[PDB]
Each structure stands twice: as C-alpha cells, then as structure tokens.
RNA sequence: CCGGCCGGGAACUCAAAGGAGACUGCCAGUGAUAAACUGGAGGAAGGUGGGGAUGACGUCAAGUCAUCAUGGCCCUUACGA
C-alpha cells in the first residue's frame, strides 16, 4: 500500500499530502515518486519484484 | 680440482624503452529514483592503493646589503692591502 510504488491514496492525493489538489496531475512528490492520478485506477495498478 | 671454470641458449631474474592496466567495471544492503560508505567475488595492486614534488589571494615591515648587486652614507698616508 504505497503511492510511490503504486499511486495516490485518493484522487490526485499525495501520500504525505503535499498535493491535496484535484488539479495536480503528473507532478510527483519529489521525496518519493507519487505521480498524481485517480486512485480508482489503483484497481489496475500493476507492479513487480 | 662443482669460487658456473670452458662451450652453448634467448623465455625468465635484471635493465633501457613503445604500451595494457585500477576508472568505483559488477552484485547487494543502507539511503530522498542522485552522490556516497561498508563487505565480497573478480584482480599483480582497491576503494585518489602508499610516498615525494606541486604550497591559492594573503599573515609575520620574519631572514640575507656575509654568494652578489644597489638610490645613497663613511673611509680614500685608511677601517684598503
């Protein structure tokens, strides 16, 4: 359950909360890559190991 | 009569040089995907592998007029020889 590994906890919502803007799209949390997109797409977030 | 004493040989020890090479090249952990540090294999040498030389503008009106030279000062029957 990560935003850097997968995605926004909420629609255009950063892990830390640096982006509580549902206008912010693409720009990541510079600490850890959180590309803001709709959290609903996390029903299709494919990762690996 | 083996202190290689007499032949013989050109790969090596050694030496004068043209160059390869070690640069964080690879894997992993830690870590803000950067950098970096540690361990190991690899490797002749490992994390600038070691040392010398190289001493940034400047500090100290510190040394030399006793290598020497010098704007001047003194001596020139002299301290010059």
Curated annotation (Swiss-Prot):
Reported function: DNA-dependent RNA polymerase catalyzes the transcription of DNA into RNA using the four ribonucleoside triphosphates as substrates.
Residues of the full protein shown: 57 to 105 of 1407
Binding site for Zn(2+) 1: 14, 16, 29, 32
Membership in a protein family: Belongs to the RNA polymerase beta' chain family.
Secretion signal span: none
UniProt protein name: DNA-directed RNA polymerase subunit beta'
Record note on quaternary structure: The RNAP catalytic core consists of 2 alpha, 1 beta, 1 beta' and 1 omega subunit. When a sigma factor is associated with the core the holoenzyme is formed, which can initiate transcription.
UniProt source species: Escherichia coli O157:H7
Transmembrane segments: none
């Amino acid at each position: 359950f990560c935003a850097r590994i997968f995605g926004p906890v909420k629609d255009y919502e950063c892990l830390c909360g640096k982006y509580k803007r549902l206008k912010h799209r693409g720009v990541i949390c510079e600490k850890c890559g959180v590309e803001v997109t709709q959290t609903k797409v996390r029903r299709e977030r494919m990762g690996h190991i």
